[PDB]
Amino acid sequence: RVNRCIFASIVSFDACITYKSPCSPDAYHDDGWFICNNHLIKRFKMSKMVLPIFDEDDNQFKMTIARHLVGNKERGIKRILIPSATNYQDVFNLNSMMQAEQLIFHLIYNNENAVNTICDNLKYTEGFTSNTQRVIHSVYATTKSILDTTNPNTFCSRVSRDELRFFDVTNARALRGGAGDQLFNNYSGFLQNLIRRAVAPEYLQIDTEELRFRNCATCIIDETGLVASVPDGPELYNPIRSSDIMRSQPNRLQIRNVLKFEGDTRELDRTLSGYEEYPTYVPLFLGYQIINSENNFLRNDFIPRANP
Amino acid sequence: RVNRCIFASIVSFDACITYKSPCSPDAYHDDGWFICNNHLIKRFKMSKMVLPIFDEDDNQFKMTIARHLVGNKERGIKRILIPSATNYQDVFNLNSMMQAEQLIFHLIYNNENAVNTICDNLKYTEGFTSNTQRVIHSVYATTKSILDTTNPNTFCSRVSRDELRFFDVTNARALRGGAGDQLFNNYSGFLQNLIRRAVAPEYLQIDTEELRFRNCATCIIDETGLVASVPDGPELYNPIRSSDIMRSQPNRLQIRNVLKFEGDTRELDRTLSGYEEYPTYVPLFLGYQIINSENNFLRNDFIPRANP
């Protein structure tokens, strides 16, 4: 039983302040997510989800996917679902969060200068060498363990080259990709994995058969990061309801524009109570994934993957 | 308790044959679906579903929608869902089905010549005036009741004008509708109802508040009918399962080309067993629906509404 979400390592550097970083039970699931749903919601505006790919016969298999927790009226910066290393400091208000968390983000985005800055600010603590030093280092080491696990370019890092993943279908078919793939490559191993687990391809080619799961992108990748935006026009309606919203800062005053329905819909809903429902979620679709026939795809372990 | 399934009236004209028309339980649901799911599947390759549209503050708003039962290899009449009056007799192999249901289809598509042809052929028999005539007429009258119920141009037909529905968003912006709507308007009241009932709009404007439920279409209406296709590229993958497939005629020899997955996927199922799943269905989307601010949209009755 191991808690595998990165931000679960967040403890206060002040040993006198008891702090328990909260996470979903899915943190103990040994899978490709190295972030637990509670964190994912709270920091990347996403919710975990599974896409059960079915066959025409009785066979099937499951693939992970996430969905937006981004509203219809959000704009600009608010659409940056996963920021790049050049703007995550503007997207995440690092000053408003715990230094253990700050540290983690800088490790995720490889900002060693900031990592060292944190160290330098804390080394003057009167009880630094006594307890703070140890605590900080522990958090660091744990985070690094995970980062190295996901990073395909580390010592003895196993990497699968049997699967391709492109975020540019028009050049993906030629097995080359485009700017979005260059950008993808510029992310840390963790972040690349995160994107791979959250964003499903529009197309999936297994062997030769091409499965178009969706004929329409729901998100894009650009120089600002993974962006929760519609590439062809008006944003999709997305009701950001409660039960996946938490007032993690009881004293922080926060306002919101809320869409409210009026009229008595209960009777209508009762007349339609006997039919199967289709969810109004907005899952992440983008790109072209290719699985070669020789790939042991159904393996239940974790392994970094990369495009040759 | 009233069975409102069109085709429930199907019974053999030969009185010695106790033919039963097996409509599903939803035939007794008083709503816009004047066809039961079994027949909807059987004849139109669709499955009944609901879009539980939610606001951002505890209100639910269900809406009907159908699901496609067409794969990604089918084409032409194999992909046409609801054929026009000019080709339904080519799409539906009427010569291999019961005369009672042939009659119904001709009533649906206003083919009076065929209606009369059926009548005439049945006139010349042993119990025409004794039993068959009555049975035929009963079926006819029942069907007509349904057709008139849905037809907005009938005597004292209750018609709502609190909703506009276009199957051409570009032109719908100016409330035009284009050729798509012109084609739509050539369908019977029943068929126009069915199409609106099954096909959800990409856009929904309620009192100027525009929502977007899907950024790309999944349905196309043209001169051949309602077609299960896409605006561009290859067709969407759609795993048609045996749970929807029904062997109506066991003597009819039929070959299917289906896919098969190999490998043990149960481990992945276990791995992801604690996550919420998003379906791989392909719902019917096409159009721009506009709701008048002074509507009575939430009524639980049936009104054959229509564009003015």
Coordinates of C-alpha atoms in Angstrom, one line a residue:
Chain A
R1 CA 0.0 0.0 0.0
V2 CA 1.8 3.1 -1.3
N3 CA 0.4 6.5 -1.8
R4 CA 1.6 7.4 -5.2
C5 CA 0.4 11.0 -5.7
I6 CA 3.2 13.5 -5.7
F7 CA 1.6 16.2 -3.7
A8 CA 0.8 13.7 -0.9
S9 CA 4.3 14.4 0.2
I10 CA 3.3 17.9 1.1
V11 CA 3.9 18.5 4.8
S12 CA 4.6 21.8 6.4
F13 CA 8.3 22.6 6.8
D14 CA 7.3 23.8 10.2
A15 CA 7.3 20.5 12.1
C16 CA 5.0 22.1 14.8
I17 CA 2.2 22.4 12.3
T18 CA 0.5 19.1 11.8
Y19 CA -0.6 18.8 8.2
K20 CA -2.1 16.0 6.2
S21 CA -2.1 16.5 2.4
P22 CA -5.6 15.0 1.4
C23 CA -5.9 12.5 -1.5
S24 CA -8.3 10.2 -3.1
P25 CA -8.1 6.5 -2.4
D26 CA -6.9 6.1 -6.0
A27 CA -3.5 7.2 -4.8
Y28 CA -3.1 3.6 -3.8
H29 CA -3.9 2.3 -7.2
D30 CA -0.8 1.1 -9.0
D31 CA -1.3 2.7 -12.4
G32 CA 0.0 5.4 -14.7
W33 CA -1.3 8.3 -12.6
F34 CA 1.3 9.8 -10.3
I35 CA -1.2 12.4 -9.2
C36 CA -4.4 11.6 -7.3
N37 CA -7.8 12.8 -8.4
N38 CA -8.1 15.3 -5.6
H39 CA -4.8 16.9 -6.6
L40 CA -5.6 16.8 -10.2
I41 CA -8.9 18.6 -9.6
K42 CA -7.3 21.2 -7.3
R43 CA -4.4 22.0 -9.5
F44 CA -4.9 21.0 -13.1
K45 CA -8.6 21.5 -13.3
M46 CA -9.2 17.9 -14.3
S47 CA -11.0 14.8 -13.2
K48 CA -10.0 11.3 -13.9
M49 CA -12.1 9.1 -16.0
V50 CA -11.9 5.8 -17.9
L51 CA -12.6 5.1 -21.5
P52 CA -13.6 1.4 -21.9
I53 CA -12.9 0.6 -25.5
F54 CA -15.3 -2.1 -26.7
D55 CA -15.1 -4.5 -29.5
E56 CA -18.0 -5.7 -31.6
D57 CA -17.5 -9.1 -30.0
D58 CA -17.4 -9.6 -26.2
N59 CA -13.8 -8.4 -25.9
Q60 CA -12.8 -5.0 -24.6
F61 CA -10.1 -3.0 -22.7
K62 CA -9.9 0.2 -20.8
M63 CA -7.9 3.3 -21.4
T64 CA -7.6 6.3 -19.1
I65 CA -8.7 9.8 -19.8
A66 CA -9.5 13.0 -18.0
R67 CA -12.1 15.7 -18.4
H68 CA -12.2 19.4 -18.1
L69 CA -13.2 21.2 -14.9
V70 CA -13.1 24.4 -16.9
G71 CA -16.2 26.4 -17.3
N72 CA -17.8 28.0 -20.4
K73 CA -17.0 31.5 -19.4
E74 CA -13.3 31.1 -18.4
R75 CA -10.8 32.9 -20.6
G76 CA -7.2 33.4 -21.4
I77 CA -5.0 32.1 -18.5
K78 CA -7.9 30.3 -17.0
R79 CA -7.9 28.0 -20.0
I80 CA -4.4 26.9 -19.4
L81 CA -5.1 23.4 -18.2
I82 CA -1.4 22.4 -17.8
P83 CA 1.0 25.3 -18.1
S84 CA 4.5 25.2 -19.6
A85 CA 7.7 25.8 -17.7
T86 CA 7.6 29.3 -19.1
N87 CA 4.4 30.3 -17.5
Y88 CA 3.4 28.0 -14.6
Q89 CA 4.5 30.7 -12.2
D90 CA 1.8 32.9 -13.6
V91 CA -0.8 30.2 -13.8
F92 CA -0.1 28.8 -10.3
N93 CA -0.1 31.3 -7.5
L94 CA 2.8 29.7 -5.8
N95 CA 3.0 32.5 -3.2
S96 CA -0.4 31.4 -2.0
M97 CA 0.6 27.8 -1.3
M98 CA 2.8 25.8 1.0
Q99 CA 6.5 25.8 0.3
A100 CA 6.5 22.1 0.2
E101 CA 4.1 22.4 -2.6
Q102 CA 6.0 25.2 -4.3
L103 CA 9.1 23.0 -4.2
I104 CA 7.2 20.2 -5.9
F105 CA 6.1 22.4 -8.7
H106 CA 9.6 23.6 -9.3
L107 CA 10.8 20.0 -9.3
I108 CA 8.1 19.2 -11.8
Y109 CA 9.1 22.1 -14.0
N110 CA 12.9 21.7 -13.3
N111 CA 13.2 25.1 -11.8
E112 CA 16.3 24.4 -9.8
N113 CA 17.0 28.1 -9.2
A114 CA 13.7 28.3 -7.3
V115 CA 14.4 25.0 -5.6
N116 CA 17.6 26.4 -4.3
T117 CA 15.9 29.7 -3.4
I118 CA 13.5 27.8 -1.1
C119 CA 16.5 26.0 0.5
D120 CA 18.3 29.3 1.0
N121 CA 15.3 31.0 2.6
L122 CA 14.7 28.1 5.0
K123 CA 18.3 27.4 6.0
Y124 CA 18.2 30.4 8.4
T125 CA 15.5 28.8 10.5
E126 CA 16.7 28.5 14.1
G127 CA 15.7 24.8 14.2
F128 CA 16.7 24.2 10.6
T129 CA 19.4 21.7 11.1
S130 CA 17.4 20.1 13.9
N131 CA 14.3 19.2 12.0
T132 CA 13.4 21.4 9.0
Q133 CA 16.4 20.3 6.9
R134 CA 15.4 16.7 7.2
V135 CA 11.8 17.3 6.4
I136 CA 12.5 19.4 3.3
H137 CA 14.9 16.9 2.0
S138 CA 12.5 14.0 2.6
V139 CA 9.9 15.8 0.5
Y140 CA 12.4 16.5 -2.2
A141 CA 13.7 13.0 -2.4
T142 CA 10.2 11.5 -2.6
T143 CA 9.3 13.8 -5.4
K144 CA 12.5 13.0 -7.2
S145 CA 11.8 9.3 -6.9
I146 CA 8.5 9.8 -8.8
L147 CA 9.9 12.2 -11.3
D148 CA 12.7 9.8 -12.2
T149 CA 10.2 6.9 -12.4
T150 CA 8.3 8.8 -15.1
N151 CA 11.3 10.2 -16.8
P152 CA 12.4 8.0 -19.8
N153 CA 15.9 9.5 -19.9
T154 CA 17.2 8.4 -16.5
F155 CA 19.5 5.7 -15.4
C156 CA 18.0 2.3 -16.4
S157 CA 14.7 3.9 -17.3
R158 CA 12.8 1.4 -19.3
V159 CA 11.2 3.0 -22.3
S160 CA 8.7 1.7 -24.8
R161 CA 9.2 2.7 -28.4
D162 CA 6.4 0.4 -29.6
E163 CA 3.8 3.0 -29.3
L164 CA 3.6 6.4 -30.9
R165 CA 1.7 9.4 -29.8
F166 CA 1.2 12.5 -31.8
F167 CA -0.6 15.7 -31.2
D168 CA -0.8 16.5 -34.9
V169 CA -2.8 14.1 -36.9
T170 CA -1.9 15.6 -40.3
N171 CA 1.7 14.8 -39.8
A172 CA 1.1 11.9 -37.4
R173 CA -0.1 9.8 -40.3
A174 CA 3.4 10.3 -41.8
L175 CA 4.9 9.3 -38.4
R176 CA 6.5 12.7 -37.9
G177 CA 4.2 14.9 -35.9
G178 CA 4.4 18.7 -35.6
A179 CA 5.0 21.6 -33.3
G180 CA 2.7 20.3 -30.7
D181 CA 4.9 17.2 -30.4
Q182 CA 8.0 19.3 -30.1
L183 CA 6.3 21.2 -27.4
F184 CA 5.2 17.9 -25.8
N185 CA 8.8 16.7 -25.8
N186 CA 9.8 19.9 -23.9
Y187 CA 7.8 18.8 -20.8
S188 CA 9.2 16.9 -17.9
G189 CA 8.8 13.1 -17.8
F190 CA 6.1 13.5 -15.3
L191 CA 4.2 16.1 -17.2
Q192 CA 4.5 14.1 -20.4
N193 CA 3.1 11.1 -18.7
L194 CA 0.3 13.2 -17.2
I195 CA -0.7 14.4 -20.6
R196 CA -0.5 10.8 -22.0
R197 CA -2.8 9.6 -19.2
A198 CA -5.3 12.4 -19.4
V199 CA -5.5 13.1 -23.1
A200 CA -6.9 10.5 -25.4
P201 CA -6.2 10.6 -29.2
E202 CA -8.8 11.4 -31.7
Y203 CA -7.6 8.3 -33.6
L204 CA -6.2 5.0 -32.5
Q205 CA -4.4 2.8 -34.9
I206 CA -3.9 -0.7 -33.8
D207 CA -1.9 -2.7 -36.3
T208 CA -3.6 -1.2 -39.4
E209 CA -7.2 -0.6 -38.2
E210 CA -7.9 3.0 -37.5
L211 CA -10.4 3.7 -34.7
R212 CA -11.7 7.2 -34.8
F213 CA -13.0 7.8 -31.3
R214 CA -13.9 11.3 -32.0
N215 CA -14.0 13.5 -35.0
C216 CA -13.3 16.7 -33.1
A217 CA -10.6 18.0 -30.7
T218 CA -11.6 19.1 -27.2
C219 CA -8.3 20.6 -26.3
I220 CA -5.0 21.9 -27.7
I221 CA -1.3 22.1 -26.9
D222 CA 0.6 25.2 -27.6
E223 CA 3.4 27.4 -26.1
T224 CA 1.3 28.3 -23.1
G225 CA 0.6 24.7 -22.2
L226 CA -2.2 22.2 -22.5
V227 CA -5.2 24.5 -23.1
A228 CA -8.8 23.8 -22.4
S229 CA -10.1 25.3 -25.6
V230 CA -12.1 24.6 -28.7
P231 CA -9.9 25.0 -31.9
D232 CA -12.9 25.8 -34.1
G233 CA -15.0 28.4 -32.2
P234 CA -17.1 28.9 -29.1
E235 CA -16.2 27.0 -26.0
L236 CA -18.2 24.0 -24.9
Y237 CA -20.7 24.2 -22.1
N238 CA -19.3 22.7 -19.0
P239 CA -21.3 22.9 -15.8
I240 CA -18.8 23.1 -13.0
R241 CA -21.0 21.6 -10.3
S242 CA -20.2 20.8 -6.7
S243 CA -19.0 17.4 -5.4
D244 CA -15.7 18.0 -7.2
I245 CA -15.2 21.4 -5.7
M246 CA -13.6 22.1 -2.4
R247 CA -13.2 25.2 -0.3
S248 CA -9.6 24.3 0.5
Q249 CA -9.0 27.9 1.7
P250 CA -11.8 28.6 4.2
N251 CA -10.7 32.2 4.7
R252 CA -10.1 33.0 1.0
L253 CA -12.8 35.0 -0.5
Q254 CA -13.6 33.8 -4.0
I255 CA -16.3 34.8 -6.4
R256 CA -17.9 32.9 -9.3
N257 CA -20.3 33.4 -12.2
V258 CA -22.9 30.6 -12.0
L259 CA -25.4 29.4 -14.5
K260 CA -28.8 28.8 -12.9
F261 CA -31.8 27.0 -14.3
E262 CA -35.3 28.1 -13.6
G263 CA -38.6 26.2 -14.0
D264 CA -39.8 23.0 -12.6
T265 CA -37.9 20.3 -14.4
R266 CA -38.8 17.4 -12.1
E267 CA -41.7 16.2 -14.0
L268 CA -39.8 16.3 -17.3
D269 CA -37.0 14.3 -15.7
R270 CA -39.5 11.8 -14.4
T271 CA -40.9 11.1 -17.9
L272 CA -37.4 10.5 -19.1
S273 CA -36.4 8.5 -16.0
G274 CA -36.6 5.2 -17.9
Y275 CA -33.9 5.9 -20.4
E276 CA -30.1 5.4 -20.4
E277 CA -28.2 8.6 -19.9
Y278 CA -25.3 10.0 -21.8
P279 CA -23.0 12.3 -19.8
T280 CA -22.4 15.9 -20.6
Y281 CA -18.8 15.8 -19.6
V282 CA -16.0 17.1 -21.8
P283 CA -13.1 14.5 -22.0
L284 CA -9.8 15.3 -23.5
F285 CA -9.3 14.3 -27.1
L286 CA -6.4 15.3 -29.3
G287 CA -4.0 13.5 -31.7
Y288 CA -3.2 10.2 -33.2
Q289 CA -2.0 7.2 -31.2
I290 CA -0.4 4.2 -32.8
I291 CA 0.1 0.7 -31.3
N292 CA 2.4 -1.7 -33.1
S293 CA 1.3 -5.3 -33.2
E294 CA 4.3 -6.6 -31.2
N295 CA 3.6 -4.3 -28.3
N296 CA 2.7 -5.9 -24.9
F297 CA 0.2 -3.1 -24.5
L298 CA -2.0 -4.8 -21.9
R299 CA 0.9 -5.0 -19.4
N300 CA -0.2 -3.7 -16.0
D301 CA 3.0 -2.1 -14.9
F302 CA 4.3 1.4 -15.6
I303 CA 6.8 2.3 -18.2
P304 CA 7.8 5.6 -19.7
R305 CA 7.1 5.8 -23.4
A306 CA 8.5 7.9 -26.2
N307 CA 8.5 8.7 -29.9
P308 CA 11.9 7.8 -31.6
Chain B
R1 CA -51.8 2.4 -19.8
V2 CA -51.5 3.0 -23.5
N3 CA -49.0 1.4 -25.9
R4 CA -47.9 4.2 -28.1
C5 CA -45.3 2.3 -30.1
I6 CA -45.9 2.8 -33.7
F7 CA -45.7 -0.7 -35.2
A8 CA -47.3 -2.2 -32.0
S9 CA -50.4 -2.6 -34.3
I10 CA -48.5 -5.0 -36.5
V11 CA -50.5 -8.2 -36.8
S12 CA -50.8 -10.7 -39.6
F13 CA -53.7 -10.2 -41.9
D14 CA -54.1 -14.0 -41.8
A15 CA -56.3 -14.3 -38.8
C16 CA -55.1 -17.8 -38.0
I17 CA -51.6 -16.4 -37.2
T18 CA -51.4 -14.9 -33.7
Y19 CA -48.6 -12.5 -34.5
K20 CA -47.2 -10.5 -31.6
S21 CA -45.4 -7.2 -32.0
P22 CA -42.8 -7.2 -29.2
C23 CA -42.5 -3.5 -28.2
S24 CA -40.3 -2.8 -25.2
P25 CA -41.7 -1.3 -21.9
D26 CA -41.0 2.3 -23.0
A27 CA -44.0 2.0 -25.3
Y28 CA -46.0 3.0 -22.3
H29 CA -44.0 6.1 -21.6
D30 CA -46.0 9.1 -22.6
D31 CA -43.4 11.1 -24.4
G32 CA -42.3 12.2 -27.9
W33 CA -41.0 8.8 -28.7
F34 CA -43.9 7.3 -30.7
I35 CA -41.8 4.3 -31.5
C36 CA -40.5 1.8 -29.1
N37 CA -36.8 1.2 -28.6
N38 CA -36.9 -2.3 -30.1
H39 CA -38.3 -1.0 -33.3
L40 CA -36.2 2.1 -33.3
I41 CA -33.2 -0.3 -33.3
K42 CA -34.7 -2.8 -35.7
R43 CA -35.7 -0.3 -38.3
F44 CA -33.7 2.9 -37.8
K45 CA -30.6 1.6 -36.1
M46 CA -31.0 3.9 -33.1
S47 CA -31.1 3.5 -29.4
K48 CA -33.0 5.8 -27.0
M49 CA -30.9 7.9 -24.6
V50 CA -31.0 11.0 -22.4
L51 CA -28.9 14.1 -22.0
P52 CA -29.1 15.1 -18.3
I53 CA -28.2 18.7 -18.8
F54 CA -27.1 20.4 -15.7
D55 CA -26.7 23.9 -14.5
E56 CA -24.1 24.9 -12.1
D57 CA -26.4 24.9 -9.0
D58 CA -28.4 21.8 -8.3
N59 CA -30.8 21.7 -11.3
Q60 CA -31.2 18.9 -13.7
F61 CA -32.6 19.2 -17.2
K62 CA -33.1 16.0 -19.2
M63 CA -33.3 15.9 -23.0
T64 CA -33.9 13.1 -25.4
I65 CA -31.2 11.8 -27.8
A66 CA -30.6 8.7 -29.8
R67 CA -27.4 6.6 -30.2
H68 CA -26.1 5.2 -33.5
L69 CA -26.0 1.6 -34.3
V70 CA -23.9 2.0 -37.4
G71 CA -20.2 0.9 -37.5
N72 CA -17.3 2.6 -39.3
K73 CA -17.2 0.4 -42.4
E74 CA -20.9 0.7 -43.6
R75 CA -21.9 3.1 -46.4
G76 CA -24.7 4.1 -48.6
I77 CA -28.0 2.6 -47.4
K78 CA -26.1 0.8 -44.7
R79 CA -25.3 4.1 -43.1
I80 CA -28.6 5.9 -43.9
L81 CA -30.6 6.1 -40.7
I82 CA -33.9 7.6 -41.8
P83 CA -34.3 7.5 -45.6
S84 CA -36.3 10.0 -47.5
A85 CA -39.6 9.3 -49.2
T86 CA -37.7 8.9 -52.4
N87 CA -35.5 6.0 -51.2
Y88 CA -37.0 4.4 -48.1
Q89 CA -38.4 1.7 -50.4
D90 CA -34.9 0.9 -51.5
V91 CA -33.4 1.1 -48.0
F92 CA -36.2 -0.9 -46.4
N93 CA -36.7 -4.2 -48.1
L94 CA -40.4 -4.0 -47.8
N95 CA -40.9 -7.1 -49.9
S96 CA -39.4 -9.2 -47.1
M97 CA -41.5 -7.9 -44.3
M98 CA -45.1 -8.1 -43.2
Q99 CA -47.8 -6.3 -45.1
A100 CA -49.1 -4.7 -41.9
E101 CA -45.7 -3.1 -41.4
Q102 CA -45.3 -2.3 -45.1
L103 CA -48.6 -0.4 -44.8
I104 CA -47.3 1.4 -41.8
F105 CA -44.2 2.5 -43.6
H106 CA -46.2 3.7 -46.6
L107 CA -48.4 5.6 -44.2
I108 CA -45.3 7.2 -42.7
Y109 CA -44.0 8.2 -46.0
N110 CA -47.5 9.0 -47.5
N111 CA -47.2 6.4 -50.3
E112 CA -50.9 6.1 -50.9
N113 CA -50.4 4.2 -54.1
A114 CA -48.7 1.4 -52.2
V115 CA -51.3 1.7 -49.4
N116 CA -54.0 1.2 -52.0
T117 CA -52.0 -1.6 -53.6
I118 CA -51.9 -3.5 -50.3
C119 CA -55.6 -3.0 -49.9
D120 CA -56.4 -4.3 -53.4
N121 CA -54.3 -7.4 -53.1
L122 CA -56.0 -8.3 -49.8
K123 CA -59.5 -7.7 -51.2
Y124 CA -59.4 -10.9 -53.1
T125 CA -59.6 -13.5 -50.4
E126 CA -61.8 -15.9 -48.5
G127 CA -62.3 -13.8 -45.4
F128 CA -61.7 -10.3 -46.6
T129 CA -65.1 -9.0 -45.8
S130 CA -65.3 -11.3 -42.8
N131 CA -62.2 -10.6 -40.8
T132 CA -59.2 -9.4 -42.8
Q133 CA -60.7 -6.1 -43.9
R134 CA -61.4 -5.2 -40.4
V135 CA -58.0 -6.0 -39.2
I136 CA -56.3 -4.1 -42.0
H137 CA -58.4 -1.1 -41.3
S138 CA -57.8 -1.3 -37.5
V139 CA -54.0 -1.2 -38.2
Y140 CA -54.5 1.7 -40.6
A141 CA -56.6 3.8 -38.2
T142 CA -54.3 3.2 -35.3
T143 CA -51.3 4.3 -37.4
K144 CA -53.2 7.3 -38.6
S145 CA -54.0 8.3 -35.0
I146 CA -50.3 8.5 -34.3
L147 CA -49.4 10.2 -37.5
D148 CA -52.1 12.9 -36.9
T149 CA -51.0 13.3 -33.3
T150 CA -47.5 14.2 -34.6
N151 CA -48.6 16.1 -37.7
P152 CA -48.8 19.9 -36.8
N153 CA -50.9 20.6 -39.9
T154 CA -53.9 18.5 -38.8
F155 CA -57.3 19.7 -37.5
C156 CA -56.9 21.6 -34.3
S157 CA -53.4 20.4 -34.0
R158 CA -51.7 22.0 -31.0
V159 CA -48.5 23.6 -32.3
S160 CA -45.9 25.3 -30.3
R161 CA -43.9 28.2 -31.6
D162 CA -41.7 28.6 -28.5
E163 CA -38.8 26.7 -30.1
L164 CA -36.8 27.0 -33.2
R165 CA -34.8 24.1 -34.6
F166 CA -32.4 24.3 -37.4
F167 CA -30.2 21.6 -38.9
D168 CA -27.8 24.2 -40.3
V169 CA -26.1 26.3 -37.7
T170 CA -24.5 28.7 -40.2
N171 CA -27.8 29.7 -41.6
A172 CA -29.5 29.3 -38.3
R173 CA -27.6 32.3 -37.0
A174 CA -29.9 34.4 -39.1
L175 CA -32.8 32.0 -38.4
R176 CA -32.7 30.8 -42.0
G177 CA -32.0 27.0 -41.9
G178 CA -30.7 26.6 -45.4
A179 CA -31.2 23.5 -47.6
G180 CA -30.9 21.2 -44.6
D181 CA -34.2 22.6 -43.1
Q182 CA -35.8 22.7 -46.5
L183 CA -35.1 19.0 -46.8
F184 CA -36.3 18.4 -43.2
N185 CA -39.6 20.1 -44.0
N186 CA -40.4 17.4 -46.6
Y187 CA -40.8 14.7 -43.9
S188 CA -44.0 13.6 -42.3
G189 CA -45.0 15.1 -38.9
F190 CA -44.0 11.7 -37.4
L191 CA -40.6 11.7 -39.1
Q192 CA -39.9 15.3 -38.3
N193 CA -40.7 14.6 -34.7
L194 CA -38.6 11.5 -34.7
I195 CA -35.6 13.4 -36.1
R196 CA -35.9 16.2 -33.7
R197 CA -36.5 13.7 -30.9
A198 CA -33.4 11.7 -31.7
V199 CA -31.0 14.3 -32.9
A200 CA -29.6 16.8 -30.4
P201 CA -28.3 20.2 -31.6
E202 CA -24.7 21.2 -31.3
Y203 CA -25.9 24.5 -30.0
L204 CA -28.7 25.5 -27.6
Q205 CA -29.7 29.1 -27.1
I206 CA -32.0 29.7 -24.2
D207 CA -33.1 33.3 -23.8
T208 CA -29.9 34.5 -25.6
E209 CA -27.7 32.2 -23.5
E210 CA -25.8 30.0 -26.0
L211 CA -24.6 26.6 -24.9
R212 CA -22.5 24.3 -27.0
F213 CA -22.8 20.6 -26.3
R214 CA -20.6 19.4 -29.1
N215 CA -18.3 21.2 -31.3
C216 CA -18.6 18.8 -34.3
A217 CA -21.6 17.1 -35.8
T218 CA -22.3 13.3 -35.9
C219 CA -25.3 13.4 -38.2
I220 CA -25.9 14.6 -41.7
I221 CA -29.2 15.4 -43.3
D222 CA -29.3 15.4 -47.0
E223 CA -31.5 14.3 -50.0
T224 CA -31.1 10.6 -49.1
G225 CA -32.2 11.1 -45.5
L226 CA -30.7 11.2 -42.1
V227 CA -27.3 9.7 -42.5
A228 CA -25.0 8.3 -39.8
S229 CA -21.9 10.1 -41.1
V230 CA -19.3 12.7 -40.4
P231 CA -18.5 16.2 -41.9
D232 CA -15.0 15.0 -42.8
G233 CA -12.4 12.2 -42.5
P234 CA -13.2 8.5 -41.8
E235 CA -16.2 7.3 -39.9
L236 CA -16.4 7.1 -36.2
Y237 CA -15.6 3.8 -34.6
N238 CA -18.8 2.2 -33.3
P239 CA -18.7 -1.2 -31.6
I240 CA -22.0 -2.8 -32.3
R241 CA -22.7 -5.4 -29.6
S242 CA -25.0 -8.5 -29.7
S243 CA -27.0 -6.9 -26.9
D244 CA -28.5 -4.6 -29.4
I245 CA -28.5 -7.0 -32.3
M246 CA -31.7 -9.0 -32.6
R247 CA -32.2 -12.0 -34.8
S248 CA -35.7 -11.1 -36.0
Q249 CA -35.6 -13.6 -38.8
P250 CA -33.7 -16.9 -37.8
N251 CA -34.1 -18.3 -41.3
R252 CA -32.3 -15.3 -42.8
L253 CA -28.6 -16.2 -43.4
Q254 CA -26.4 -13.2 -42.8
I255 CA -22.6 -12.7 -42.7
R256 CA -21.1 -10.0 -40.5
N257 CA -17.6 -8.6 -40.6
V258 CA -16.7 -7.9 -37.0
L259 CA -13.6 -7.1 -35.0
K260 CA -11.9 -9.2 -32.4
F261 CA -9.4 -8.3 -29.6
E262 CA -6.7 -10.6 -28.4
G263 CA -4.9 -10.6 -25.1
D264 CA -6.0 -10.8 -21.5
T265 CA -7.4 -7.4 -20.7
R266 CA -8.9 -8.4 -17.3
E267 CA -5.9 -7.1 -15.4
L268 CA -6.4 -3.7 -16.8
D269 CA -10.1 -3.9 -15.8
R270 CA -9.0 -4.7 -12.3
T271 CA -6.4 -1.9 -12.4
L272 CA -9.0 0.7 -13.4
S273 CA -11.9 -0.9 -11.5
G274 CA -12.3 2.0 -9.1
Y275 CA -12.8 4.7 -11.7
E276 CA -15.8 6.4 -13.3
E277 CA -16.3 5.5 -16.9
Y278 CA -17.2 7.6 -19.9
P279 CA -19.1 5.7 -22.7
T280 CA -17.8 5.1 -26.2
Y281 CA -21.2 5.7 -27.7
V282 CA -21.9 7.8 -30.7
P283 CA -25.0 10.0 -30.1
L284 CA -26.8 11.9 -32.8
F285 CA -25.8 15.6 -33.1
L286 CA -26.9 18.2 -35.7
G287 CA -28.4 21.6 -35.4
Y288 CA -29.1 24.8 -33.5
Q289 CA -32.0 24.8 -31.2
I290 CA -33.3 28.1 -29.8
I291 CA -35.6 28.4 -26.9
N292 CA -37.9 31.4 -26.6
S293 CA -37.7 33.3 -23.3
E294 CA -41.5 32.9 -22.9
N295 CA -41.5 29.2 -23.5
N296 CA -43.4 26.3 -21.9
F297 CA -40.6 24.0 -22.6
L298 CA -40.9 22.0 -19.5
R299 CA -44.4 20.7 -20.1
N300 CA -44.7 16.9 -19.8
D301 CA -47.2 16.5 -22.6
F302 CA -46.7 16.1 -26.3
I303 CA -46.9 19.0 -28.6
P304 CA -46.1 18.7 -32.4
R305 CA -44.1 22.0 -32.4
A306 CA -42.9 23.5 -35.6
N307 CA -40.9 26.3 -37.1
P308 CA -42.9 29.3 -38.4

